[PDB]
C-alpha positions in Angstrom: -2.8 -49.2 -54.8 0.0 -47.0 -53.0 0.3 -49.7 -50.4 0.3 -53.1 -52.0 1.2 -57.0 -50.4 4.7 -57.5 -51.7 6.0 -54.0 -51.6 6.0 -52.8 -48.1 5.1 -55.5 -46.4 4.2 -59.2 -47.4 1.3 -61.3 -46.0 1.5 -64.5 -44.4 0.0 -67.3 -45.7 -0.4 -68.6 -42.4 -1.8 -66.1 -39.9 -1.3 -66.3 -36.2 -4.2 -65.9 -34.2 -4.5 -64.1 -30.8 -0.7 -62.7 -31.5 0.5 -59.2 -29.9 -0.7 -56.1 -31.9 2.6 -55.2 -33.2 4.9 -57.3 -32.6 9.0 -56.8 -33.4 12.1 -59.1 -33.2 15.3 -58.2 -33.1 19.0 -59.5 -31.8 21.8 -57.6 -30.5 24.1 -59.5 -32.3 22.4 -58.4 -35.8 23.9 -55.5 -37.4 20.6 -53.9 -39.2 18.6 -54.0 -35.6 21.5 -51.7 -34.4 21.3 -49.4 -36.7 16.9 -49.9 -35.9 17.8 -49.3 -32.5 20.9 -46.8 -32.4 20.7 -44.5 -35.6 16.9 -45.0 -37.0 14.9 -45.1 -33.7 11.9 -47.3 -35.5 10.6 -48.7 -32.3 10.1 -45.2 -30.9 8.6 -43.6 -34.2 6.2 -46.3 -35.1 5.0 -45.8 -31.5 4.7 -42.1 -32.1 2.4 -43.1 -34.9 0.6 -46.0 -33.8 -3.8 -45.2 -32.4 -4.8 -45.0 -29.0 -4.8 -48.4 -27.6 -2.3 -50.4 -29.9 0.6 -52.5 -27.6 3.9 -52.8 -28.4 6.0 -56.3 -27.9 9.6 -56.3 -28.7 11.6 -59.8 -28.6 15.1 -61.1 -28.4 16.1 -64.6 -30.8 18.0 -67.5 -30.7 19.4 -68.0 -33.7 22.3 -65.5 -33.7 25.4 -66.3 -31.4 24.8 -69.5 -30.2 25.5 -69.7 -26.7 25.8 -66.3 -26.2 22.4 -65.5 -28.1 20.2 -67.7 -25.7 21.9 -65.8 -22.9 20.8 -62.7 -24.3 17.3 -63.7 -24.7 17.1 -64.6 -21.5 18.8 -61.6 -20.4 16.0 -59.3 -22.3 13.8 -61.6 -20.2 15.3 -60.1 -17.2 15.3 -56.4 -19.0 11.3 -56.9 -19.8 10.3 -58.6 -16.2 12.3 -55.9 -14.3 11.4 -53.0 -16.9 14.8 -51.9 -17.8 14.4 -52.4 -21.3 15.5 -48.8 -22.0 18.6 -48.5 -19.4 20.3 -51.5 -21.1 19.4 -52.1 -25.0 22.1 -49.4 -25.6 24.8 -50.3 -23.9 24.0 -54.2 -24.8 24.4 -53.2 -28.6 27.5 -51.3 -27.8 28.9 -54.1 -25.9 28.2 -56.9 -28.3 29.1 -55.2 -31.6 31.0 -51.6 -30.8 33.5 -52.7 -28.2 33.1 -55.7 -27.9 32.9 -56.6 -24.3 30.3 -58.7 -23.9 31.9 -62.2 -24.3 29.8 -64.2 -21.7 27.2 -64.0 -19.4 29.2 -62.4 -16.9 29.7 -59.7 -19.0 25.9 -59.4 -19.8 25.3 -59.3 -16.1 28.1 -56.0 -16.1 25.7 -53.9 -18.1 22.7 -54.5 -16.1 24.8 -54.0 -12.9 26.6 -50.9 -14.0 22.6 -49.5 -15.7 22.1 -49.8 -11.9 19.9 -52.6 -11.7 21.5 -54.5 -8.2 23.4 -58.0 -8.7 21.0 -59.8 -5.9 17.7 -58.1 -7.8 19.8 -59.2 -11.1 20.7 -62.7 -10.1 16.8 -63.5 -8.6 15.5 -62.6 -11.7 17.8 -64.3 -13.9 17.0 -67.5 -12.2 13.1 -66.9 -11.6 10.3 -68.9 -13.7 8.7 -65.8 -14.1 11.9 -65.1 -16.6 11.6 -68.8 -17.9 8.0 -68.3 -19.5 9.1 -65.0 -20.4 11.9 -66.7 -22.4 9.5 -69.3 -23.3 7.0 -66.5 -24.7 9.8 -65.0 -27.0 10.9 -68.3 -28.3 6.8 -69.2 -29.0 6.0 -66.2 -30.9 9.3 -66.1 -33.1 8.2 -69.9 -33.9 4.5 -69.1 -34.9 5.8 -66.6 -37.2 8.7 -68.5 -39.5 11.3 -66.6 -38.0 14.9 -66.9 -39.4 15.9 -63.3 -39.9 16.1 -59.6 -38.0 14.9 -57.4 -37.8 10.8 -58.5 -38.2 7.9 -56.6 -37.4 4.8 -58.5 -37.3 1.1 -56.3 -37.1 -1.7 -58.4 -35.8 -0.4 -61.7 -36.3 -0.9 -61.2 -40.6 1.7 -58.5 -41.8 5.1 -58.3 -42.3 7.2 -55.4 -42.9 9.3 -55.4 -45.8 11.8 -52.7 -45.4 13.7 -54.3 -48.4 10.4 -52.5 -50.4 11.2 -48.8 -49.3 13.9 -45.9 -50.4 17.0 -46.0 -48.2 18.4 -42.7 -49.4 17.4 -40.9 -46.5 17.1 -42.2 -43.0 14.5 -40.1 -42.0 12.2 -40.5 -45.0 12.7 -44.7 -44.3 11.7 -44.1 -41.1 8.6 -42.6 -41.6 7.7 -44.7 -44.4 8.0 -47.6 -41.9 6.1 -46.2 -39.5 3.5 -44.8 -41.5 3.5 -48.4 -43.1 2.8 -50.0 -39.6 -0.1 -47.9 -39.1 -1.9 -48.4 -42.6 -1.5 -52.0 -41.8 -2.8 -51.3 -38.1 -5.8 -49.5 -39.3 -6.3 -52.8 -41.8 
């Protein structure tokens, strides 16, 4: 076929019931994730091609960067609760991987403060039980599906994107192939 299991995607032998439609995992410590976000804008190009009515979910993972990695999963929970994903993602990537000015929870906090979220509002979210279960959700979803590597994308808890089996000579072409694969999978 044109789209083949084991080629642009793999199939989960153990499918995940009731999983979010399009589910992406990343880590701010993850170099390919930096590229997916900064250079390729994968999430955004996928959205642009998804059908009407499909929800897009993105979660952080713990298994990179030890203690800070977990702080980052809680911080991403704060970002989701406050709806400020679009304002912290870039400085978080750059603070961890580019300038290396993120070394502690406090440095993660500074990024939110500088993005305009108020200290009070941040600390309140950070400590809230609405953020805790949002951390739990991130962990559960990664738990449900094997996850030992990022970036990772899953469609309807049954298919996993396989970017290794796509051409990377042209960046734009890789992205379109990636996005089209999600849309194919979405309709499957």
